[PDB]
Design an enzyme around this catalytic site. Structure first.
Site, PDB file in Angstrom:
ATOM      1  N   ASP A 248      -0.347  -7.518   2.072  1.00  0.00           N
ATOM      2  CA  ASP A 248       0.193  -6.140   1.944  1.00  0.00           C
ATOM      3  C   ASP A 248       1.743  -6.206   1.995  1.00  0.00           C
ATOM      4  O   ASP A 248       2.360  -5.946   3.060  1.00  0.00           O
ATOM      5  CB  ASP A 248      -0.318  -5.264   3.049  1.00  0.00           C
ATOM      6  CG  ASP A 248      -0.011  -3.802   2.837  1.00  0.00           C
ATOM      7  OD1 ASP A 248       0.375  -3.389   1.702  1.00  0.00           O
ATOM      8  OD2 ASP A 248      -0.179  -3.021   3.817  1.00  0.00           O
TER       9      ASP A 248
ATOM     10  N   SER B  66       3.964   3.211   7.970  1.00  0.00           N
ATOM     11  CA  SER B  66       3.674   2.026   7.207  1.00  0.00           C
ATOM     12  C   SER B  66       4.808   1.648   6.215  1.00  0.00           C
ATOM     13  O   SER B  66       5.562   2.480   5.691  1.00  0.00           O
ATOM     14  CB  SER B  66       2.278   2.065   6.536  1.00  0.00           C
ATOM     15  OG  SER B  66       2.233   3.036   5.506  1.00  0.00           O
TER      16      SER B  66
ATOM     17  N   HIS C 214       0.793  -1.216   0.000  1.00  0.00           N
ATOM     18  CA  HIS C 214       0.000   0.000   0.000  1.00  0.00           C
ATOM     19  C   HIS C 214       0.840   1.287   0.000  1.00  0.00           C
ATOM     20  O   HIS C 214       0.302   2.329  -0.259  1.00  0.00           O
ATOM     21  CB  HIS C 214      -1.017   0.065   1.121  1.00  0.00           C
ATOM     22  CG  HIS C 214      -0.422   0.462   2.421  1.00  0.00           C
ATOM     23  ND1 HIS C 214      -0.136  -0.459   3.409  1.00  0.00           N
ATOM     24  CD2 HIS C 214      -0.018   1.669   2.883  1.00  0.00           C
ATOM     25  CE1 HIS C 214       0.402   0.174   4.436  1.00  0.00           C
ATOM     26  NE2 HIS C 214       0.500   1.462   4.139  1.00  0.00           N
TER      27      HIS C 214
HETATM   28  C1  LIG Z   1     -13.333  -3.686   5.518  1.00  0.00           C
HETATM   29  C2  LIG Z   1     -13.361  -2.277   4.938  1.00  0.00           C
HETATM   30  O1  LIG Z   1     -13.542  -2.122   3.724  1.00  0.00           O
HETATM   31  O2  LIG Z   1     -13.154  -1.268   5.875  1.00  0.00           O
HETATM   32  C3  LIG Z   1     -13.457  -0.015   5.305  1.00  0.00           C
HETATM   33  C4  LIG Z   1     -13.947   0.946   6.415  1.00  0.00           C
HETATM   34  O3  LIG Z   1     -12.968   2.025   6.799  1.00  0.00           O
HETATM   35  C5  LIG Z   1     -13.537   3.111   7.660  1.00  0.00           C
HETATM   36  O4  LIG Z   1     -12.760   4.313   8.032  1.00  0.00           O
HETATM   37  C6  LIG Z   1     -11.466   4.165   8.634  1.00  0.00           C
HETATM   38  C7  LIG Z   1     -11.489   4.576  10.118  1.00  0.00           C
HETATM   39  C8  LIG Z   1     -10.079   4.792  10.710  1.00  0.00           C
HETATM   40  O5  LIG Z   1      -9.177   5.253   9.730  1.00  0.00           O
HETATM   41  C9  LIG Z   1      -8.163   6.170   9.953  1.00  0.00           C
HETATM   42  C10 LIG Z   1      -8.352   7.396  10.573  1.00  0.00           C
HETATM   43  C11 LIG Z   1      -7.264   8.257  10.719  1.00  0.00           C
HETATM   44  C12 LIG Z   1      -6.004   7.938  10.209  1.00  0.00           C
HETATM   45  C13 LIG Z   1      -5.789   6.735   9.563  1.00  0.00           C
HETATM   46  O6  LIG Z   1      -4.574   6.328   9.029  1.00  0.00           O
HETATM   47  C14 LIG Z   1      -3.302   6.743   9.603  1.00  0.00           C
HETATM   48  C15 LIG Z   1      -2.324   5.538   9.727  1.00  0.00           C
HETATM   49  C16 LIG Z   1      -2.290   4.684  10.723  1.00  0.00           C
HETATM   50  C17 LIG Z   1      -1.319   3.831  10.423  1.00  0.00           C
HETATM   51  C18 LIG Z   1      -1.015   2.798  11.145  1.00  0.00           C
HETATM   52  C19 LIG Z   1      -1.317   2.627  12.435  1.00  0.00           C
HETATM   53  C20 LIG Z   1      -0.920   1.426  12.908  1.00  0.00           C
HETATM   54  C21 LIG Z   1      -0.334   0.659  11.965  1.00  0.00           C
HETATM   55 CL1  LIG Z   1       0.320  -1.010  12.151  1.00  0.00          CL
HETATM   56  S1  LIG Z   1      -0.329   1.482  10.551  1.00  0.00           S
HETATM   57  O7  LIG Z   1      -0.848   4.080   9.373  1.00  0.00           O
HETATM   58  N1  LIG Z   1      -1.394   5.131   8.873  1.00  0.00           N
HETATM   59  C22 LIG Z   1      -6.891   5.881   9.449  1.00  0.00           C
HETATM   60  N2  LIG Z   1      -6.760   4.726   8.865  1.00  0.00           N
HETATM   61  C23 LIG Z   1      -7.463   4.504   7.779  1.00  0.00           C
HETATM   62  O8  LIG Z   1      -8.134   5.353   7.199  1.00  0.00           O
HETATM   63  C24 LIG Z   1      -7.333   3.064   7.265  1.00  0.00           C
HETATM   64  C25 LIG Z   1      -7.513   3.040   5.831  1.00  0.00           C
HETATM   65  C26 LIG Z   1      -7.245   1.667   5.403  1.00  0.00           C
HETATM   66  N3  LIG Z   1      -8.247   0.721   5.902  1.00  0.00           N
HETATM   67  C27 LIG Z   1      -7.765  -0.604   5.510  1.00  0.00           C
HETATM   68  C28 LIG Z   1      -8.049  -1.684   6.502  1.00  0.00           C
HETATM   69  C29 LIG Z   1      -8.413  -1.031   4.225  1.00  0.00           C
HETATM   70  C30 LIG Z   1      -8.357   0.793   7.351  1.00  0.00           C
HETATM   71  C31 LIG Z   1      -8.414   2.223   7.859  1.00  0.00           C
HETATM   72  C32 LIG Z   1     -14.832   3.621   7.047  1.00  0.00           C
HETATM   73  O9  LIG Z   1     -15.443   4.652   7.900  1.00  0.00           O
HETATM   74  C33 LIG Z   1     -15.271   5.865   7.318  1.00  0.00           C
HETATM   75  C34 LIG Z   1     -16.357   6.271   6.297  1.00  0.00           C
HETATM   76  O10 LIG Z   1     -14.335   6.620   7.565  1.00  0.00           O
HETATM   77  C35 LIG Z   1     -15.811   2.475   6.899  1.00  0.00           C
HETATM   78  O11 LIG Z   1     -17.033   3.049   6.391  1.00  0.00           O
HETATM   79  C36 LIG Z   1     -17.986   2.286   6.950  1.00  0.00           C
HETATM   80  C37 LIG Z   1     -18.440   2.752   8.329  1.00  0.00           C
HETATM   81  O12 LIG Z   1     -18.407   1.265   6.436  1.00  0.00           O
HETATM   82  C38 LIG Z   1     -15.274   1.456   5.917  1.00  0.00           C
HETATM   83  O13 LIG Z   1     -16.184   0.286   5.673  1.00  0.00           O
HETATM   84  C39 LIG Z   1     -16.151  -0.155   4.375  1.00  0.00           C
HETATM   85  C40 LIG Z   1     -16.106   0.952   3.329  1.00  0.00           C
HETATM   86  O14 LIG Z   1     -16.158  -1.338   4.033  1.00  0.00           O
END
Ligand SMILES: CC(=O)OC[C@H]1O[C@@H](OCCCOc2cccc(OCc3cc(-c4ccc(Cl)s4)on3)c2NC(=O)C2CCN(C(C)C)CC2)[C@H](OC(C)=O)[C@@H](OC(C)=O)[C@@H]1OC(C)=O
Lengths: 250, 8, 26
Positions: free
Chosen positions: A99, A198, A43
């Site tokens: 990944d 990451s 990723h």
């Molecule tokens: C299974 C799946 O598809 O999960 C997606 C969800 O993902 C949800 O949102 C993420 C919430 C927390 O996110 C952060 C909020 C703030 C910052 C974030 O990233 C910063 C970060 C953290 C890190 C690491 C921390 C620890 C590590 Cl080890 S790496 O690296 N970078 C995140 N992380 C993300 O963005 C990731 C994006 C990637 N996905 C992968 C597993 C595919 C996970 C989260 C969606 O909620 C929304 C809209 O924000 C959810 O939507 C809903 C409720 O359904 C999504 O559900 C879906 C679309 O299916």
């Protein structure tokens, strides 16, 4: 990294920074596994939802670093990518299953006090060390919090978490190719990887041979150091046959 | 970020 | 070959400041 410490010099001599040319920018961590091969998370290189799809010539590797921002003259080594390989069953559409990516360096690098490869686990090492409650170490130049950023490489020691606890922390469907790590809410310590960490390594030190093994790749997390949430790491041993495939082949 | 050597 | 043995630590028999915390978790 959140609630980490400043690294000692030479403490993670396999740590690699993935660095964007323009804007000249930290993209991800990575790791050196021999003189011409670097391991990272898929990723870091391909992530359609962010519009990320890097080619070779967009990126550099910087090896032997300590300072996040400074050019560490006569210490760091800046290398160019010949080829990027992404696991063919990498799943970016759903859960980041598999990944993992390899990068082939243009030229083999000379090792030094600050540049040295990490070991990759064998079955027995994995079976021995990859147990819930055992700690590994994560390093990187990523953010200090969700919200900012460190002057030097950060380090944090994190316990591997039981698989059912991992699964119950999230709505994401976990695969056998990932594991999770971090302290639980009522434990005294905290800490997590955060953005910019990451693709870096989750390492463990073998109590048998005193060598450092890369057991995971920093893969994803929901936030950074949130209570009841844990970081997820690519299970390197599970994908080793793919690693060895690529290497005995390019 | 400190500017790197142009050579790379 | 000499993978995972750090020039500034294992190769000099020096410990880093928190590696004990890992070895203790075993
Ligand atoms: C299974 C799946 O598809 O999960 C997606 C969800 O993902 C949800 O949102 C993420 C919430 C927390 O996110 C952060 C909020 C703030 C910052 C974030 O990233 C910063 C970060 C953290 C890190 C690491 C921390 C620890 C590590 Cl080890 S790496 O690296 N970078 C995140 N992380 C993300 O963005 C990731 C994006 C990637 N996905 C992968 C597993 C595919 C996970 C989260 C969606 O909620 C929304 C809209 O924000 C959810 O939507 C809903 C409720 O359904 C999504 O559900 C879906 C679309 O299916």
């Amino acid at each position: 990294i959140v609630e980490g410490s400043d690294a000692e010099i030479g403490m993670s001599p396999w740590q690699v920074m993935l660095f964007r040319k323009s804007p000249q920018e930290l993209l991800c961590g990575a790791s050196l596994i021999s003189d011409r091969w670097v391991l990272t998370a898929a990723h870091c290189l391909l992530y359609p939802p962010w519009d990320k799809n890097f080619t070779e010539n967009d990126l550099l590797v910087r090896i032997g670093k300590h300072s996040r921002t400074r050019y560490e003259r006569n210490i760091e080594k800046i290398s160019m990518l010949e080829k990027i390989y992404i696991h063919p069953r990498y799943n970016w559409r759903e859960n980041l299953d598999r990944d993992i990516a390899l990068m082939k360096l243009k030229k083999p690098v000379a090792f030094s006090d600050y540049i040295h490869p990490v070991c990759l686990p064998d079955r027995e090492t994995a079976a021995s060390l990859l147990q819930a409650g055992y700690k590994g170490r994560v390093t990187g130049w990523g953010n200090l919090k969700e919200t900012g950023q460190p002057s030097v490489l950060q380090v944090v020691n994190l316990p591997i978490v039981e698989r059912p606890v991992c699964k119950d922390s999230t709505r994401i469907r976990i695969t056998d190719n990932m594991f999770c790590a971090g302290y639980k809410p009522d434990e005294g310590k905290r800490g997590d990887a955060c953005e910019g960490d990451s693709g870096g390594p989750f390492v463990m030190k073998s109590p048998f041979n005193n060598r450092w093994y890369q057991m995971g790749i920093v893969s994803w997390g929901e936030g950074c150091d949130r209570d009841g949430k844990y970081g997820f790491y690519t299970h390197v041993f599970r994908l080793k046959k793919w690693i060895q495939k690529v290497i005995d082949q390019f | 970020f400190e500017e790197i050597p142009e050579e790379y | 070959a000499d993978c995972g043995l750090r020039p500034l630590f294992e190769k000099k028999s020096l410990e880093d400041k928190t590696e004990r915390e890992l070895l203790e978790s075993y």
